[model samples]
Target chain A: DGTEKWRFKTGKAIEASPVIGEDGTIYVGSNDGHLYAINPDGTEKWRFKTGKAIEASPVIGEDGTIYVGSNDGHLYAINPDGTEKWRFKTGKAIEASPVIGEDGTIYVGSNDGHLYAINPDGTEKWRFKTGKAIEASPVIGEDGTIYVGSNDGHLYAINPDGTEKWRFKTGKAIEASPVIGEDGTIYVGSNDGHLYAINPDGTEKWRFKTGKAIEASPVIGEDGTIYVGSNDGHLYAINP
Target chain B: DGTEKWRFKTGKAIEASPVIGEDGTIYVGSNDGHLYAINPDGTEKWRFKTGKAIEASPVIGEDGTIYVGSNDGHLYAINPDGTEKWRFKTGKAIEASPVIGEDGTIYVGSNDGHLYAINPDGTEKWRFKTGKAIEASPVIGEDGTIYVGSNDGHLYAINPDGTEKWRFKTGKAIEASPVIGEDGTIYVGSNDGHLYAINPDGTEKWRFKTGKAIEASPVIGEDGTIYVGSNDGHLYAINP
Candidate 1:
């Protein structure tokens, strides 16, 4: 177990992770629409501001670029030295975080009910339209597939080329971020009060009732057990 | 012009009226289940307690007896001394207040979905069952008839003997208290965002759209204007 570590003050409140750069620089997205870069010693190096506040985490690309979304309806690409690389706009605000594909494709969700894929240069690759808003971050499969939950209560497996591979309906709205295990199982939580394990084939694996609504994403530990926090005030560990 | 005449303090917050006695004693019901009595000089008199909070207002009989309901699901009769004279139990809580008839019949609504007509001695003379909870006070007409709203989106008229005279469907729930004019017109507001005027025969007279829901009771002004506050942030004065 680790003790408390160093912390850096952000421009405003944050809702997620501080992306660690290759040089150990910690990048944080703030609700004030600014991304602050702080050294491991806790001093801010620089910051890149966006059009609006961000409600999700920031992601670091392989080449030292950063990706994030904002309520201003733009997915922003910022250089490590605090310059705006490019921006991709959606129909509505974006609260979902981004995940970078191996080929430098940036995938993110938006309140406009679309999961957008942007090229490294901020050009539109493609977008998969869900029935409702996409406010949850997506997980990537080893084979370049994207698994994300939509507000329409469905966990979608979108092809890398932006086509629907298969869908598993959770029967309730899912704000939880989906996590993929080494076993190819996609685990997600739904407000329907269940932690669902969807098989790689998009079949029903198993859903463990948590006795309350599960809105947060799940985590797969190294031991292959799934850990999920529920609104029912319990952090559950379930064996698939 | 009414301008900040005087204010008296109760033990806690109150949701309604202060019944004035002929001797100028103001009787108030508080959420703490105490009926507070203050004189015209703003001095505390005495208080009577019940099993639970008295959510509705109190009514004064001609003989100086106080009638009120409580969340404890009881209709209570208190003598002028602030002591419990009698109590009649219902199946559920009581948020609806009471009205006294010429025959000393106390008609009040209850959360039990029944409008109870209690005798002066706290005996149930008759009860009219509505489809849903009755949480609005009943108004008595010149013919000793009673009119009240139900959470089931209807206004019911009960005869003196406790039989359904007629019910007009408002197509929405009514928490706003209804008022009757001298010309036999019944006026009430509905959550359907309309103020309705109904004929005596349980037919729709006319309905005025207020662009918002009305939950407070409407009143008839001396100038024949009807006044009601809507959630639309406006107090409307409508002419017949």
Candidate 2:
């Protein structure tokens, strides 16, 4: 709404956006593959590296455990001190941001086309299949519904038990993450040039059109102002 | 395949992967919202800011001009000397990376849900629309096909003239960028928990599954190994 309060620097270009913690610590990734912790005053507290580039943002668990993906082909769980707690290896790279469930389970997607649920202890809970790669971040609904999108051009609602609840087809590939609305509706953008508001049961609620491909995630304001960016070089604030 | 050759520091975190120029100079973005030029030896040459964070990677043109996006809601054309040639304002944040077309056109996505085509001189050439945000980078094919993904649950193909070619629907949102194989196959991941291999005609080829969402782009090795990351705490490498 306003602007950046402060700024920091890295060795390369930053693709990982900054996330502010409740304690006001700023965490972000670097192409140099380092995760940095910055204080509220904009000073470095500590940094960790994964030996490759990091494009994913770090998600903090309630217990202060930090989770993030890396180009080195590993998902790492870091302690508050930036020490490795545990790590999991998948079949490809991890760019999706991690989301933590209430029970401490981790849900994520990969280039391998699998939706995986992992226990906090680093064991596999379950996995489901889709038509293509899942690169968007997963959001958990109040009813434990997991919503995600795929390059296969479908939006899926998965049950907490790793079963498919519903699916919707769009005209193009979906690369942006869906934001859950207060009314249990899902909002996402597609390369087909439409913004879709899908109900929880996988029914289309409404749609908005844009001039080009929409690949970024939507941030909703309190007044229901949808903020998004597009490939057409425009940012829009649409009223729902 | 081996490891990092060198490392340097900047004013902010670097999420935008670097572009290695013909002369090995590294160009990248920072959360400090600056585009930096680093020598092959990892020494800072110079830097320029666009009043916001530069989350997207930079692409170098034939004349050594750098093109990049910023969270300040603008796209910039920076000269070789680290001076601002021009800046194009957008509606929201510019998180998508930039790509250079064969004809020197600059293509990029934004959080604003549009795919923009800018001429060499920094004027808008054309624009296309997606339903949602566009954080995924665009890939240009030899046949002049432009491929990109969106959060709207669709992958889109746009012709060089900005006409819609075709689209594919996936299970969920897509935040990962697409990588084209030598055989014209498009590979990308989505938040839907799948990695998709889409044919040139917008059909699904194959898909793999991971435990979490994938926002990182895939890197294809010379041997056809696909590498990427997932929020599920895994780095993966798949043999083609």
Candidate 3:
């Protein structure tokens, strides 16, 4: 049995998940267009308002800066005390979770069909274009390469300098993010009812089909099991 | 997202769900043979151990007394402060959750194919025998009748005097408990793959067939939807 200590309320539903700060403070976005800073004891420390609802999960930067996407097409960077350091505007709304690279580069996707890599000072370092929208969060591979999927039915492998290393096409759209296994095998799911395993060289290692489409991301278990969910109402386990 | 303020560990797994008191205290049984009283702050208020695992869900009586069945063949009555009030022994192990009548009578089933009725003082009032073991918990209808399913494939309706009112046979074993709808319609599922709707008089009103057997109990929705899970891997909604 869980003993609920307290519940903090917001004006609207919160689809965005939370990021924790080093000081045990919680930063989460609410549909009410506010990023709230809450203490560990469930009290509100402060709140920073966005122009629209925030449905994207936020990421914590190394320098104690919290970055999140808003439906107002702006990517916001907030200080630890809930003050806005900067906000980068995209062409459309942003629902993709933000990711940071080893060198402090912040990469995020937007409905504007582009992945924008921002420097530590919130300036755009580079922007890579893809067909359709980009709701998939980016993952930095071991070689400093960034891997991400797009609704354009392709998984793009980008070099650290923002050039496309390669792109692997699927039969349909891919909203799921890619996961790297221990041996550098990348696993991703698509809306085409298949889970694809790609090598680090950007070639298809193998693909497993399911009864229905898979929009969920794949998780790697310690047993080398690839677990993902299908729209057919089954959590599939792909054993190595 | 959750802070996970605290998680109190038990000695074993807990198959029994928790029941909350008016004061927000959660009473749940663990396979560790103990019934735990958790305070509102996730602290161990107190625990009363039985001879064996107590997997049965604890029921809260109006007088603040808690009742639960242990695999040790005993139905234990616990006080608000976690002290044992009394315990009634059965011929065999007790796994069915205890039910309380309006008159404060405690009713529970045992693997000995008997349902025991005891007074609030822990004295045996009466007992009714079934053809097979009873794991399905008893449900008290508005008319003071107790309906419970048995492994003998029969739904038995017992009178307040501990006599059999009526018993309706199904095609297979019934481990699912019976639920009374707003119209006094008793609905129960069986391993026979049919959801049976029985009249208060113990006659079958109708039965709906599913793709496979159903052991989980039927849940009645506000809009008269009978939701039940089947072994066929579907949640069926029998809409009225």
Question: Interface RMSDs of all predictions?
Answer: 26.7, 23.4, 15.4
Residues A75-122 of candidate 2 have per-residue lDDT tens digits of 788888878898887666676887888888899887777778888877
Assess the local accuracy of residue A40 in candidate 3 as a C-alpha lDDT between 0 and 100: 96
From the highest lDDT down, the ranking of the candidates is 3, 1, 2
TM-score of every candidate's chain A: 0.88, 0.82, 0.96
Question: In candidate 3, residue A181 scores what lDDT?
Answer: 92
lDDT of 1 at A123: 93
What TM-score would every model get versus the actual structure?
Answer: 0.49, 0.49, 0.52
Candidate 3 structure quality by residue, lDDT tens digits, B1-240: 111122222233337778899999988887678888999999999989998888778899998998989989999999999888999999888877988999899999999899999999999999999988898799999989999898899999999999999999998889878899999999999999999999888778889999899988989899999999999889989875
RMSD of 2: 19.3
Cα RMSD (angstroms) for every candidate in the order listed: 18.4, 19.3, 13.4
* Candidate 1: regions farther than 4 A off: A1-11, A40-44, A221-223, B1-240
Candidate 1 differs from the real structure by a C-alpha RMSD in angstroms, to one decimal, of 18.4
Best by lDDT: 3
RMSD to native, candidate 3: 13.4
Instruction: Estimate the overall C-alpha local distance difference test score of candidate 3.
Output: 0.88
Cα lDDT of candidate 1 equals 0.84
Clashing pairs in 3: none
Question: What would the per-residue lDDT of candidate 1 be over residues B1-240, giving only the tens digit for each residue?
Answer: 111222223233346767788999998888778889898999899988887787777888888888888888888888998888899999898887787778778888888899988888867799999988986888888877799999999999888888899998877889977999889999989999999999888988999998888998888999889999999999999998
Off by over 4 Å in 3: B1-240
